């Protein structure tokens with residue numbers, strides 16, 4: 647099990663100002679460190695953050711967090727459940743900033759909520775250095791859904807943080823699970839009122855303003871003032887990243903379909919869904935380390951049965967091990983680019999049920 651540690655710097659807070667924190671299980675015989683960013687959507691104005699505080703409070707506050715957490719999937723220490731990194735140091739960073747891990751603004755006389763996700767990551771990494779991270783050889787920043795986008799927004803800043811702190815030998819890498827979204831047109835044109843039905847583009851634009859959200863420097867320099875929302879979209883931010891990033895993405899992510907207003911499938915919907923899979927496949931063509939099965943599902947890497955799905959006969963744990971090997975061109979029998987080509991949910995027979 648992983649043990650909670652509330653951040654020693656209590657000015658780094660969840661939305662309601664309670665301390666943010668992390669769950670840790672040390673593996674002293676290991677120089678590998680897995681820092682996992684939890685997911686869970688976001689909120690982008692006082693009204694919808696107030697509603698989320700009323701019935702999703704754990705995503706906004708540490709006041710009710712349990713003392714321990716079981717590591718599952720890629721965070722499991724059992725080899726049968728986690729053939730990839732069962733022996734690593736395991737860190738689970740609860741998501742309590744509702745800002746897709748982008749914020750850097752404190753709660754004040756003028757701000758009802760704090761949005762500090764990016765400062766949370768930075769501070770966790772700092773306090774971990776004194777608990778063994780300083781000796782690490784690889785730090786894999788991983789994350790699912792909003793945490794998957796968080797990886798893309800933060801992996802390079804973590805690299806740069808550790809460099810400026812004097813730890814050049816720690817290799818920072820990213821594993822973005824289910825955080826590779828398309829800013830496409832919705833199937834039906836609902837209006838952005840809440841957070842689920844809202845279109846992705848308008849969601850992020852309002853959010854950044856409200857959170858004081860920050861994005862990777864090189865991506866920021868491309869899109870420039872006002873257009874930083876662009877960097878929340880994997881296919882636009884990924885090419886600007888310097889750290890190695892493995893991308894895991896269902897071709898038909900349920901959260902993508904939700905924001906696209908997709909729920910007897912007639913021609914119009916069949917075409918829309920097939921176009922979505924092809925567009926997603928297109929954006930992954932030049933991502934050399936990726937695992938993108940043709941399934942309708944949400945998230946994967948901390949589910950107990952994440953070992954089950956395969957693309958072209960290769961499991962995600964195997965693909966991640968081949969990726970490790972590639973970073974010591976293509977390896978014999980150890981493929982790293984695994985993107986399904988069939989065009990409909992569950993044409994891959996290993997899709998979860």
Ligand SMILES: *[C@@H]1O[C@H](CO)[C@@H](O)[C@H](O)[C@H]1NC(C)=O
Nearest residue numbers: 655656657658752765769772
């Ligand atoms: C604690 O966090 C605050 C807010 O980000 C920051 O200003 C300060 O530098 C941190 N303290 C230390 C000792 O790093």
Ligand SMILES: Cc1[nH]c(C(F)(F)F)cc1C(=O)O
Nearest residue numbers: 687791792795827846849901
């Ligand atoms: C469900 C979801 N949609 C988006 C969007 F708008 F960028 F596509 C981000 C998330 C997330 O939780 O990270």
